[PDB]
Design a protein around this ligand. Structure first.
Ligand SMILES: [Cl-]
Ligand SMILES: [Cl-]
Ligand SMILES: [K+]
Ligand SMILES: [Mg+2]
Ligand SMILES: [Mg+2]
Ligand SMILES: [Mg+2]
Ligand SMILES: [Mg+2]
Ligand SMILES: [Mg+2]
Ligand SMILES: [Mg+2]
Ligand SMILES: [Mg+2]
Ligand SMILES: [Mg+2]
Ligand SMILES: [Mg+2]
Ligand SMILES: [Mg+2]
Ligand SMILES: [Mg+2]
Ligand SMILES: [Mg+2]
Ligand SMILES: [Mg+2]
Ligand SMILES: [Mg+2]
Ligand SMILES: [Mg+2]
Ligand SMILES: [Mg+2]
Ligand SMILES: [Mg+2]
Ligand SMILES: [Mg+2]
Ligand SMILES: [Mg+2]
Ligand SMILES: [Mg+2]
Ligand SMILES: [Mg+2]
Ligand SMILES: [Mg+2]
Ligand SMILES: [Mg+2]
Ligand SMILES: [Mg+2]
Ligand SMILES: [Mg+2]
Ligand code: NA
Ligand code: NA
Ligand code: NA
Ligand code: NA
Ligand code: NA
Ligand code: NA
Ligand code: NA
Ligand code: NA
Ligand code: NA
Ligand code: NA
Ligand code: NA
Ligand code: NA
Ligand code: NA
Ligand code: NA
Ligand code: NA
Ligand code: NA
Ligand code: NA
Ligand code: NA
Ligand SMILES: [Sr+2]
Ligand SMILES: [Sr+2]
Ligand SMILES: [Sr+2]
Ligand SMILES: [Sr+2]
Ligand SMILES: [Sr+2]
Ligand SMILES: [Sr+2]
Ligand SMILES: [Sr+2]
Ligand SMILES: [Sr+2]
Ligand SMILES: [Sr+2]
Ligand SMILES: [Sr+2]
Ligand SMILES: [Sr+2]
Ligand SMILES: [Sr+2]
Ligand SMILES: [Sr+2]
Ligand SMILES: [Sr+2]
Ligand SMILES: [Sr+2]
Ligand SMILES: [Sr+2]
Ligand SMILES: [Sr+2]
Ligand SMILES: [Sr+2]
Ligand SMILES: [Sr+2]
Ligand SMILES: [Sr+2]
Ligand SMILES: [Sr+2]
Ligand SMILES: [Sr+2]
Ligand SMILES: [Sr+2]
Ligand SMILES: [Sr+2]
Ligand SMILES: [Sr+2]
Ligand SMILES: [Sr+2]
Ligand SMILES: [Sr+2]
Ligand SMILES: [Sr+2]
Ligand SMILES: [Sr+2]
Ligand SMILES: [Sr+2]
Ligand SMILES: [Sr+2]
Ligand SMILES: [Sr+2]
Ligand SMILES: [Sr+2]
Ligand SMILES: [Sr+2]
Ligand SMILES: [Sr+2]
Ligand SMILES: [Sr+2]
Ligand SMILES: [Sr+2]
Lengths: 53, 132, 337
RNA sequence: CGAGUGGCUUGCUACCUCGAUGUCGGUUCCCUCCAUCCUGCCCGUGCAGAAGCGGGCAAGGGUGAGGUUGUUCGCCUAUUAAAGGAGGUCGUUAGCUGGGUUUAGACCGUCGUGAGACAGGUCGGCUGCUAUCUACUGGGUGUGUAGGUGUCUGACAAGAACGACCGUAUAGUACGAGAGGAACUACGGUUGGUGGCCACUGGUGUACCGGUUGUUCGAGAGAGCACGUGCCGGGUAGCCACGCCACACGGGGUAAGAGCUGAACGCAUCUAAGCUCGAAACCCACUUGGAAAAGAGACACCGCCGAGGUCCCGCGUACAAGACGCGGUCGAUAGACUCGGGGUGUGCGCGUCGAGGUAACGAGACGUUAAGCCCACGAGCACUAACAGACCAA
RNA sequence: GGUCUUAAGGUAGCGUAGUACCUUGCCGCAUCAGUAGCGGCUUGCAUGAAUGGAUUAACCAGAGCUUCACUGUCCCAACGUUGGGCCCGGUGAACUGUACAUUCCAGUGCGGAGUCUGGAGACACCCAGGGGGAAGCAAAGACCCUAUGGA
RNA sequence: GCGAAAGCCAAGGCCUGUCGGGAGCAACCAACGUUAGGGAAUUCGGCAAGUUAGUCCCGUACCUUCGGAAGAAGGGAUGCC
RNA sequence: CGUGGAAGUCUGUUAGAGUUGGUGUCCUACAAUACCCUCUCGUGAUCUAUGUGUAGGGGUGAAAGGCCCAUCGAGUCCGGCA
């Protein structure tokens, strides 16, 4: 699995999956990715993100 | 009860106000008790994903309001742990009103439901639209 | 009428003082059954990682599925059974009779012991066998020591010495089994005693925390609400009633917490290998890199990294042995982060 | 109607205390009692079953959360296996609380000519002390046993280290017309308690990196101050719980009870002698402490001109002093450096762009730049520092 | 009762009240559950008209009650910051002190004992700690009675 | 900046709100910062802490002695160039 | 609509005055009435300095038996007095 936010591979036996109100699902590899997402930042706009680079 | 298949950190207590994820006419529920639970001195009785709870209707239709009913916890904000180590958390805390036989009082369920809850309460699951 | 409530903490691990030996001392050993064999081994704690295992439990709904299991990596290089001590049965319990030592000693055993220069293994053996003919032989145990030098992550070279009981078939067969092991040089490995998938009891001296108060040491509550603002936050209500006019040792008080011997039961051994498969990127924090004989113990193990931990075949297992679990994955992701 | 036991209620007495022993309730923390609420094992039934009801042994463990009221009590609600009662100065202010009671202010009703009063109500209203002794929790130094190192023994001591529940199979079975509806046993999980641990999730993280407001250093760069971070965002190590791991089976002796054999008393009789069974309770099992156990212990090796130890030095798996543990060139113990592994989020400078603007100027954008800065971790590496060296010792 | 004491015999209003003993009065509202609070009833133990009654916009560090929002008050505690605390140099008091004193369990005793009795335990000294006991220290009580006391 | 407000800085003054040294510096206490999920369940009582907040625009109930209630409430906006 | 600028008027740590709560800190104190935060007032029956007056069964008192130099239901000193 890849982190639906940054794009890196989620280490097996790690991370969290957030279940949206509409039933959608977001697999986060870490708290950092979750926190940046909560601030409304889009992964492509953050240089350190695999998605961006 | 039948093993949940996941480890839960109870995210609710006696007195918590949660969402009623169904079409019974009850919009908001207040946790009053947790089925089969026994705490300890000073400890607030806790409830979480998969637990059956006695509840009170705080918001909703006039006929439903103030009624003391049973319900099943379908979603919670505090993470739960699945066998493969992944944590799972929802956008809100929700329960579905249930009867003496554990069949949902309402006809339709609103929002996603945890698979673990779906397995424990089959009839509650069959009414589910999305099982995550 | 004042709600009931269990007391704060167990009275079974007292007194809560600093341990006399940093090296753990088992206070019990397994039963005597099949083939004779050393009833214990030891290693050094490195750190933890997780593993993905295939469910073995035949009574589990998840039998045959992937499962993530926490694992503590312990470096378990070969040890040396340097001597065979015999105990005789006396009206005052068991007492050491004699010991049969060797010639081959590790290059740095002299950092702890006064290595024998003139010894007579045959006279000791003779004395032991004579005691057996008389039926006064209590039990047989091996003086064992670790080889810290084989573990780079551990600074010490001074071997850690402990006594490990030898149990097995009849006394004659294990007396001979013991002597065989010792005579070689005493070299034995984790493999010789344990098989991956079995349950072991792990002993170790816990992490030290120096002096700590009742809240952390015994789990007593903190003063609540207004009672927390008057000048008392982490102090208990009272040291006792008016009568008896003395403070009972049972009241939760401040003192040494940690650095105590603990013996944790039923620790499943996930894998016994050798090399760097379990090692972590960047190295185990405050430890180093693993690349040698190791043991993956399910869950936690008492003590900090670098501490000597002891293994022993489980004396009171709850479940049946499900040998050689299938390890699909072993995390090597950095522990820093 | 009669006979008792307790000392939980109330009354009685005035024996102790008024050059002063801080009232009620609660809270917190510890020990206990049994007249047992649950749990274990039993007996009877107006015992089919399921469930009741009554009784016996039994104090191991448990007995919780909430609404009014200061309440104790009690009423009430939903949970529960059950939500038992009592003693410890009606345990517990040199522990807390100040809501009740019970000063000085004030109001009401009633009483009083009045000052004032009330075993009525009401609003406000003060709690000091640096522990000498003893007690206990933890930590040291000495003496005794009587040169050193290592390993043990186990008299004693502590434990609840484990208690309880739900679910599945048994089984829609036994039982019962039906309705209803078990058990042995084997499994899965939960809860309360207990000990430990940090890979995972979560918290912190005034290490660190970034953004940004006011002001000062002329601007830029880079900084100070705005409380021990100006504010905001992220967060390594570490510490943590909201996270993770572990906490029997089985023996032995019994109670109540079910029985065997069996006599006094040819019979009968579980009892008088003897015996087979039988409780969550008792003992063992398991964990923890424990050579100062005065019968002051055991074994092996080393040494008595030298074993070992101390000072010293580099350090932490240790730590309030002390103690403990490791390394000291026969070396990787700490640091520098370089890698690795991490945190933040794209540096200064310069170039292009940029709404505009004659121009000056210009917030900002892109590139250089997976940049820059930083690291309590790891590895490599003797480069620096563990040098020099003093001393005790049968 | 369908007057009598002692003049009159409570009118408007308000009312279970800061007044109502009974009392958690009854009905209702609100809450899962409300000796509280509010509305109504009210025969008021013992309301009531400048001993002022009723009512009231505005005002209030005045008493009580409810709701929304919020949060470590709580579930249940954690980590961190600064000053102490601990160790070292220097400076350097006070409270308190019949005596002895290593105590513990029972008992006894003017019935609430470290010191009496019987047992049990107990090698000496020192550091830190929270305060169980010394009916700890601080005051010839802050309650009650007494005095041919005081104001 | 509304300001004799805060905060920062001059002129001027001071390091005398006058004992120091050491331990990542333990327990415990005083003042504090940050705390997941629940959100007053705590308590006699939201005590303590917190929430809100400046300014402009929209909009503003019962009741009223017509003054007031009222900043009721509720909603939106806010920098730089 | 504007002007005007009233008020024992509002906000306000302006100066200044005061002190609801914390039942916080202190309680051999910094202090025989102190410290911090919160809180109240702040154009008036306001606050404030100096001067001046009222004296003990007497003053003064928007009244608490409050105050009259750390003492007041009758000051302090000495005397009556051993
Ligand atoms: Cl408390
Ligand atoms: Cl409940
Ligand atoms: K008295
Ligand atoms: Mg409680
Ligand atoms: Mg980590
Ligand atoms: Mg991560
Ligand atoms: Mg008397
Ligand atoms: Mg006293
Ligand atoms: Mg009985
Ligand atoms: Mg008991
Ligand atoms: Mg009492
Ligand atoms: Mg006391
Ligand atoms: Mg006190
Ligand atoms: Mg005190
Ligand atoms: Mg009151
Ligand atoms: Mg008066
Ligand atoms: Mg009062
Ligand atoms: Mg009424
Ligand atoms: Mg009149
Ligand atoms: Mg007196
Ligand atoms: Mg007096
Ligand atoms: Mg009096
Ligand atoms: Mg008289
Ligand atoms: Mg008089
Ligand atoms: Mg939280
Ligand atoms: Mg309560
Ligand atoms: Mg407040
Ligand atoms: Mg004047
Ligand atoms: Na205090
Ligand atoms: Na007391
Ligand atoms: Na009696
Ligand atoms: Na009390
Ligand atoms: Na019991
Ligand atoms: Na109650
Ligand atoms: Na008393
Ligand atoms: Na007090
Ligand atoms: Na009290
Ligand atoms: Na038995
Ligand atoms: Na009247
Ligand atoms: Na006022
Ligand atoms: Na806090
Ligand atoms: Na004491
Ligand atoms: Na000086
Ligand atoms: Na006009
Ligand atoms: Na004040
Ligand atoms: Na006078
Ligand atoms: Sr009590
Ligand atoms: Sr041992
Ligand atoms: Sr032992
Ligand atoms: Sr206080
Ligand atoms: Sr006593
Ligand atoms: Sr009994
Ligand atoms: Sr029973
Ligand atoms: Sr009482
Ligand atoms: Sr009552
Ligand atoms: Sr009071
Ligand atoms: Sr009362
Ligand atoms: Sr009264
Ligand atoms: Sr002697
Ligand atoms: Sr069943
Ligand atoms: Sr049926
Ligand atoms: Sr600063
Ligand atoms: Sr702000
Ligand atoms: Sr019997
Ligand atoms: Sr000895
Ligand atoms: Sr009338
Ligand atoms: Sr004696
Ligand atoms: Sr102290
Ligand atoms: Sr200057
Ligand atoms: Sr000075
Ligand atoms: Sr932070
Ligand atoms: Sr409340
Ligand atoms: Sr409450
Ligand atoms: Sr607004
Ligand atoms: Sr004004
Ligand atoms: Sr003002
Ligand atoms: Sr007060
Ligand atoms: Sr405060
Ligand atoms: Sr102070
Ligand atoms: Sr004071
Ligand atoms: Sr003005
Ligand atoms: Sr004077
Ligand atoms: Sr005189």
């Amino acid at each position: 699995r890849e982190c639906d936010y940054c794009g890196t591979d989620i280490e097996p036996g790690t991370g969290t999956m957030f279940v949206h109100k509409d039933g959608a699902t977001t697999h986060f590899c870490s708290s950092k990715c979750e926190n940046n997402a909560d601030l409304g930042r889009e992964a492509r706009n953050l240089e350190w993100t695999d998605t961006a680079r | 009860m039948e093993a949940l298949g996941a480890d839960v950190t109870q995210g609710l207590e006696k007195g918590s106000l949660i969402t009623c994820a169904d079409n019974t006419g009850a919009r908001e529920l207040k946790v009053i008790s947790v089925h089969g639970y026994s705490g300890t001195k000073n400890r607030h009785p806790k409830a979480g994903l998969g637990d059956k709870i006695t509840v009170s209707v705080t918001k909703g239709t006039p006929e439903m309001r103030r009624q003391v009913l049973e319900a099943v916890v379908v979603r919670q904000r505090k993470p739960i742990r699945r066998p493969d180590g992944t944590r799972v958390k929802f956008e809100d805390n929700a329960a579905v009103i249930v009867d003496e036989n554990e069949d949902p009082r309402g006809t339709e369920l609103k929002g996603p439901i945890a698979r673990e809850v779906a397995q424990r309460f089959g009839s509650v699951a069959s009414a589910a639209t999305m099982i995550v | 009428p004042q709600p009931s409530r269990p007391r704060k903490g167990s009275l079974g691990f007292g007194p809560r003082k600093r341990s006399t030996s940093e090296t753990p001392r088992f206070n019990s050993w397994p039963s005597d059954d099949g083939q004779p064999g050393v009833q214990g081994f030891a290693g050094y704690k490195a750190g933890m990682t997780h593993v993905v295992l295939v469910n073995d439990e035949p009574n589990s709904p998840r039998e045959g599925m992937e499962e993530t299991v926490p694992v503590t990596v312990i470096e378990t290089p070969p040890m040396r059974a340097v001597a065979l001590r015999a105990y005789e049965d006396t009206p005052y319990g068991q007492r050491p009779l004699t010991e049969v030592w060797t010639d081959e000693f590790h290059s740095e055993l002299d950092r702890t012991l006064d290595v024998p220069e003139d010894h007579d293994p045959d006279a000791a053996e003779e004395q032991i066998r004579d005691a057996h003919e008389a039926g006064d032989l209590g039990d047989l145990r091996l003086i064992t020591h670790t080889v810290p030098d084989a573990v780079p992550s551990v600074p010490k070279k001074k071997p850690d010495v402990m006594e490990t009981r030898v149990g097995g078939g009849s006394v004659s067969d294990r007396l001979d089994h013991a002597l065989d092991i010792v005579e070689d040089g005493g070299e034995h490995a984790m493999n010789d005693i344990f098989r991956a998938g079995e349950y072991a009891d792990v002993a170790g001296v816990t992490k030290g925390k120096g002096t700590q108060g009742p809240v952390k040491r015994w789990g007593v509550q903190k003063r609540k609400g207004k009672h927390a603002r008057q000048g008392w936050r982490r102090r208990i209500g009272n040291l006792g009633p008016w009568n008896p006019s003395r403070v009972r040792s049972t009241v939760p008080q401040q003192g040494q917490t940690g650095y105590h011997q603990r013996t944790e039961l039923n620790k499943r051994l996930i894998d016994i290998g050798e090399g760097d498969e379990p090692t972590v990127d960047g190295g185990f924090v405050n430890y180093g890199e693993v690349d040698g004989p190791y043991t993956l113990v399910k869950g936690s193990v008492p003590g900090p990294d670098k501490r000597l931990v002891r293994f022993r075949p489980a004396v009171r297992p709850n479940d049946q042995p499900r040998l050689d679990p299938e390890v699909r994955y072993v995390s090597n992701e950095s522990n820093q982060g």
